[PDB]
Design a protein around this ligand. Structure first.
Ligand code: A1LW3
Ligand code: A1LW3
Ligand code: CO
Ligand code: CO
Lengths: 369, 374
């Protein structure tokens, strides 16, 4: 049951994620060097953009945009930087029928950041609109059709190459699996209802939604998704559990709601993590007891793990499974000093969950250890 | 044998201790400088070490120590305003000192604005005493009476949480120490700031070949280099001046929102290997046209100076030369460390030459003009 079918309009996929950061040039360099992206496009003084510098980096279909202000006392960007640290500002969706989505969103009460506008260059035209979501986060809808340019109109090829990024081993991340937003206490349901009402998303039901793990996760979660379930937006709030809630820590250190992690889907997670580790990236410490009590729990299970299990243990890759399939997942250390944003790499084998079984599994290994 | 002014009665500025940057993302900043510029992360302070308000990443390359600092909490007033006003930039030019008391007494007596009066910190490796005074803009000087402290960097710092196999693997860049640190001032402020160094710290004006030359038309700046009595620490002070083009010093002040450090120069004894391996790490530098090297070789025809380094390689790497009859220096400037047109770095090697490359204002301007009009 996906609820009522929206009468026109479609959210095709994640278009890109825009970050507001203190130093967009060094941030782009962090994600190309550490996380396997390559700089794709630029806007700045050199291109006529005199207020904002924008570095676009890409890995297959994953596009991150890093933005910093050129001028002192830019009040909007500055306040966001002082409040949150480096973080996600805009989760952008590629859309069909922008007019229908925007008209509906406006009728249903969305706060409009910028009404429908368009930008053009030699390679075609793209239309946009931007509304607010939780915290300081916004959604830009991008009606890009089959735009043939570099990324978006007005963006130019990077000023310089990067021989270091070019020589480093490829990390094989393909697309954005899901983007997770942490909310303050008691806000999960109202934020989920915003997606249902304003965008006509519906709640996505997975194997995770059928077995509660509140005691070990210290959170509540609802996953909201569009009608075709191509875009997945988990919404968390803090909950009482055995240990301090990570969601409450996020809200305290981020200064309110925001994106806690972005999960990046791969079809070869062993090569991904080997090559990310070669790039100096670090991931959560996983005690070896986790892997003893998984080979044994899998003894009473019929699912067949295709990846070499000793290599999974060596790389500290996690596994969650039911009887019909499984997923592999691993979490980076934080992208900044604040205990706020991190990244996830995930590979799916006939399993639509998000790893909730690992809340209990990891918690007990760390505790026993 | 120069007039270095009155000898200070007590107190010694030994060398640059470290440079502290206030930045938006200190973890990512340290990674920029280790990966791109050849540093190694040395030490850390943060939540995991008991430092609950500030995260600090210390990176080192031989004697060069850079510290990157970010706030942990929302709406940290002091660091927040600095970030919004300046972008990422230098906050503290720290000096290793002897006889802190007399230095601090003299500075306070002469009107230094004190940021933090003398205090001290200790751990299992010993004690270090500090004081901090303001200099130009939002920049400050911490005096570090380091004596012979035995810890990693300073009391309270710990080893980095993780190693970095990428920083470890990359080619060595052979930068040794901080040659000088340049502060850009707004209109008409150069003399006042230079006087502050003479009066408050008992620095004196350092005279070099550059001071005996006419370059304002090409440089669009006026400069005075202040240095400590023993001339181990050099602090050039720039202000805008009318020139043939817009002053880069004026542009700095517009985009930095006031005075601040414009560049830090790092001394090397093998600039060829340094620049080769910085380029291998993806660093970029100013583009220098072939006309520069053609015109330089022509000028050198009337000189007795002997360039030791391979000139074809210097041209290939776009390294600059300035020279007189007794020696020369080699120098090269990175692209900017951030999007705002503010801070950059300099790599410099000296062969019996105490200048700062002022001959290259004319040489580069004229080389670019000849390359266009040809
Ligand atoms: C990294 C924090 N941790 C985390 C995150 C997820 C996750 O990404 C997730 C769960 N539900 N939804 C919708 C998601 O996106 C799953 C398990 C675990 N752990 C065991 S953890 O504490 O290490
Ligand atoms: C990078 C901007 N440029 C620059 C900087 C210096 C320098 O480091 C310097 C000059 N005086 N003092 C005290 C210094 O430290 C010398 C020459 C040139 N150019 C020709 S430049 O426009 O490329
Ligand atoms: Co996830
Ligand atoms: Co210099």
């Amino acid at each position: 049951d996906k609820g009522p079918k929206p009468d026109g309009g479609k959210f095709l996929c994640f278009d890109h994620i825009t970050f507001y950061v203190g130093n967009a040039k060094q941030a782009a360099s962090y994600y190309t060097t550490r996380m396997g992206f390559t700089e794709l496009a630029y806007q700045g003084l050199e291109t006529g953009s005199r207020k904002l510098a924008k570095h676009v980096v890409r890995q297959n279909k994953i596009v991150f945009v890093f933005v910093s202000a050129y001028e002192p006392d830019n009040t909007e960007l500055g306040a966001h930087l002082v409040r949150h640290g480096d973080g996600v500002k805009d989760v952008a969706f590629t859309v069909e029928d922008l007019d229908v989505i925007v008209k509906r969103a406006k009728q249903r009460g969305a706060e409009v950041v910028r009404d429908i506008w368009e930008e053009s260059d030699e390679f075609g035209t793209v239309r946009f609109a931007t509304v607010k979501t939780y915290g300081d986060t916004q959604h830009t809808f991008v009606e890009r059709k089959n735009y043939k340019g570099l990324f978006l109109p007005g963006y130019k090829a990077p000023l310089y190459d990067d021989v270091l990024a070019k020589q480093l081993p490829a990390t094989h991340l393909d697309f954005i699996d899901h983007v997770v937003g942490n909310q303050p206490d008691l806000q999960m349901e109202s934020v989920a209802a915003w997606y249902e009402k304003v965008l006509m998303f519906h709640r996505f039901w997975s194997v995770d939604d059928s077995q509660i793990h509140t005691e070990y996760s210290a959170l509540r979660s609802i996953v909201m998704t569009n009608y075709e379930e191509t875009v997945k937006m988990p919404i968390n709030e803090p909950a009482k559990g055995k240990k301090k809630s990570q969601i409450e820590e996020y809200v305290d250190y981020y200064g309110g709601a925001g994106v806690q992690h972005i999960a990046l889907n791969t079809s070869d997670i062993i090569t991904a993590i080997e090559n990310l580790r070669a790039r100096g990236m670090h991931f959560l410490s996983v005690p070896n007891t986790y892997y003893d009590q998984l080979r044994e729990r899998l003894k009473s299970s019929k699912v067949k793990i295709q990846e070499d299990m000793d290599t999974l243990q060596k790389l500290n890759i996690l596994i969650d499974y039911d009887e019909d399939g499984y997923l592999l997942q691993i979490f980076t250390k934080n992208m900044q000093d604040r205990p706020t944003l991190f990244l996830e790499v995930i590979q799916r084998h006939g399993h639509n969950g998000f790893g909730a079984g690992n809340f209990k599994a990891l918690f007990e290994a760390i505790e026993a250890d």
